[PDB]
């Protein structure tokens, strides 16, 4: 028996809440729209990772359309003004998009793990990425269809809302037969969707970082073993340490060639090391040094270009991995308050005042942070790629 006005929050706090939600909504809309325009318009952009980025943009658009304004209108107004169909659609879409985002991040990390740690393996094709996207969507559908199929709007008789029309308040919550099944479903969803993909992504990105750094270190070492041993041969006085220097050069040349026209240049370089090794074996150093001094010509004409181009791809590959790590970490950090608040309100038996504080001040903030994550990914993509910056300028110049 409690009468409640149609608007509950103070006008100032309601205004700041709605303006923040509108700001994040506009950011998400603009970012996802420009990302979709960039990926669709430019044909060179289309790759497996970029296809998964487009899928992420589609999921974020689904959140922006079917979840954010509905949640904002639910928060500003008392109870749930919309019908049961709208509430179930909103919740189901939110869950589907969360699962799709997690699985797309996992697929992106797996693809880059294959690209970096095991580059010899063939690169995944566009068709394989598309069927992976389809099976990811199917998995999300089949893992969070129970939320939609089992839901209802319940009427609360003790609170009645009035403007001059009085009606009991309505709210849509998961009406499980008992709290045990709801808790076990929420915990298994947290384990399958958040915790296990978190651990997998973190450990696999760490392994990529280890693998990526090791490749460049060996390349520099082999290059400097060939370079510094060449100076040894020039300054060597007898044939014992010319043989030793040539022995070190040969192993480095074989190692550098193993690292993945380029192999042909190492075929010539190794043959000349053998040519200088035969002269050193014969005994005299002077003609072996002359044969070693001609290795500089092929090193400059076949190996310097190889080393600088091999170095180039390595550096460029880190930036993409770092961006994918940042977007994965920001996704995990943004959804952490929601999952930890659910766990605290479900497992950690707190004081009724603590739960009251949780509902009023912590739940809306965690909900806003999770929804605001959808507007963060386009910012990361634009600021970590010069290609997306060019797309931003082209779209703005075209439409303005």
């Amino acid at each position: 028996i409690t009468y409640v006005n149609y608007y509950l929050h103070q006008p100032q706090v309601a205004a700041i809440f709605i303006i923040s939600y509108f700001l994040i909504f506009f950011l998400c809309m603009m970012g996802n729209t420009v990302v979709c325009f960039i990926v669709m318009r430019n044909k060179h952009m289309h790759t497996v990772t970029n296809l998964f980025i487009l899928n992420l943009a589609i999921s974020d658009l689904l959140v922006g359309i079917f979840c954010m304004p509905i949640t904002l209108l639910d928060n500003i107004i008392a109870g749930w003004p919309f019908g049961n169909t709208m509430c179930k659609i909103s919740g189901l879409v939110q869950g589907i998009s969360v699962a799709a985002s997690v699985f797309t991040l996992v697929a992106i990390a797996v693809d880059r793990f294959q690209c970096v740690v095991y580059p010899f393996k063939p690169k995944l094709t566009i068709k394989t990425a598309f069927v992976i996207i389809m099976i990811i969507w199917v998995l999300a559908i089949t893992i969070m269809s129970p939320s939609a199929v089992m839901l209802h709007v319940q009427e609360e008789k003790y609170y009645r809302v009035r403007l001059n029309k009085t009606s009991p308040v309505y709210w849509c919550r998961e009406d499980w037969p008992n709290q045990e099944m709801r808790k076990i479903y929420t915990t298994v969803l947290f384990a399958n969707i958040y915790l296990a993909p978190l651990s997998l992504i973190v450990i696999m990105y760490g392994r990529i970082g280890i693998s990526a750094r090791r490749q460049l270190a060996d390349l520099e070492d082999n290059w400097e073993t060939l370079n510094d041993n060449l100076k040894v041969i020039e300054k060597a006085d007898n044939a014992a340490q010319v043989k030793d220097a040539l022995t070190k050069m040969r192993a480095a040349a074989l190692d550098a060639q193993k690292a993945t026209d380029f192999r042909h240049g190492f075929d010539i370089l190794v043959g000349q090391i053998d040519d200088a090794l035969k002269l050193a074996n014969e005994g005299k150093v002077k003609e072996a040094q002359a044969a070693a001094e001609q290795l500089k010509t092929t090193r400059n004409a076949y190996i310097q270009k190889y080393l600088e181009r091999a170095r180039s791809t390595l550096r460029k590959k880190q930036k993409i991995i770092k961006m994918l790590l940042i977007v994965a970490l920001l996704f995990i950090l943004s959804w952490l308050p929601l999952w930890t608040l659910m766990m605290l309100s479900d497992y950690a038996d707190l004081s009724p005042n603590e739960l009251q504080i949780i509902n009023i001040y912590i739940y809306p903030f965690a909900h806003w942070l999770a929804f605001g994550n959808s507007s963060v990914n386009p910012i990361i993509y634009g600021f970590f790629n010069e290609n997306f910056r060019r797309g931003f300028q082209e779209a703005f110049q075209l439409q303005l």
């Epitope: 022995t247 070190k248 040969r250 192993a251 480095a252 074989l254 190692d255 193993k258 075929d267 190794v270 043959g271 053998d274 090794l277 035969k278 074996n281």
Partner: antibody
Framework: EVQLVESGGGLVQPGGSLRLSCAAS????????LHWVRQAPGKGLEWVAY????????SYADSVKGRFTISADTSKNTAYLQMNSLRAEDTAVYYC?????????????????WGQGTLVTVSS | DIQMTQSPSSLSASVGDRVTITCRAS??????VAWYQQKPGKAPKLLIY???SLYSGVPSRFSGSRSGTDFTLTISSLQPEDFATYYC??????????FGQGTKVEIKR
């Protein structure tokens, strides 16, 4: 089918002379380097010498330098290892093996084909 | 000069076992080591070349790998005809060949 066959191994007095012959069938000795690797009774393999008749490049182990000479006659498609001033520790089973030329697989396949090995015994 | 140390000289193992032989090189040669099998009274047979590549015709149970200057041979299932002496050779240059000391795989009892 390629095949290395060793012959000439026999008992000799210390400080004597011997000539091992390695006949190569199937392949030509021009396209491969021929190596001599010896294994003492009860001990492990040790590399003795090699010849590359394409470039005529010969080399010997430090224990046999100045005492063994390796030649290769491509008309008969054979190699020879002349062992003179033989010492008592030169008694062993000698194998003639085939190592291809750089680049590519022939070089990376080291000693893919060996001979049956001929035993030399150096004692008075 | 490139010392090639094959430490696990004694290997007592039974049929079906997964035996492992390690080999340590003094210098940092590339993946240019080979593994040979020699049964008593016969010539060595090439098992592994390039430190990882299986030679043609030999059983697939043998497998070699390289980490740093540590080259390891492995037999996943020790068949009864796998009892022989295994040698670890490095082939960096024609005149620089150093075999390992050899490991005699015997029958566990």
């Amino acid at each position: 089918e390629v095949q290395l066959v060793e012959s000439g191994g026999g008992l000799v007095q210390p400080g004597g002379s011997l000539r091992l012959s390695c006949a190569a069938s199937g392949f030509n000795v021009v396209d491969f380097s021929l190596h001599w690797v010896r294994q003492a009774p009860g001990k492990g393999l040790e590399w003795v010498a090699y010849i590359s008749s394409s470039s005529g490049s010969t080399s010997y182990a430090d224990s046999v330098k100045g005492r063994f000479t390796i030649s290769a006659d491509t008309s008969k498609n054979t190699a020879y290892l002349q062992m003179n001033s033989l010492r008592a520790e030169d008694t062993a089973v000698y194998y003639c093996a085939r190592w291809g030329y750089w680049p590519g697989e022939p070089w990376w396949k080291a000693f893919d084909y060996w001979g049956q090995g001929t035993l030399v015994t150096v004692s008075s | 000069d490139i010392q090639m140390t094959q430490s696990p000289s004694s290997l007592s193992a039974s049929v079906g076992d997964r035996v492992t032989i390690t080999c340590r090189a003094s210098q940092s040669v590339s993946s240019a080591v080979a593994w040979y099998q020699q049964k008593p009274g016969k010539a060595p047979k090439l098992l592994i070349y390039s430190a990882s590549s299986l030679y043609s015709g030999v059983p697939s149970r043998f497998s070699g790998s390289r980490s740093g200057t540590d080259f390891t041979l492995t037999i996943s299932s020790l068949q009864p005809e796998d009892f022989a002496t295994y040698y670890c050779q490095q082939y960096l240059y024609y005149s620089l060949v150093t075999f390992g000391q050899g490991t005699k795989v015997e029958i566990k009892r």
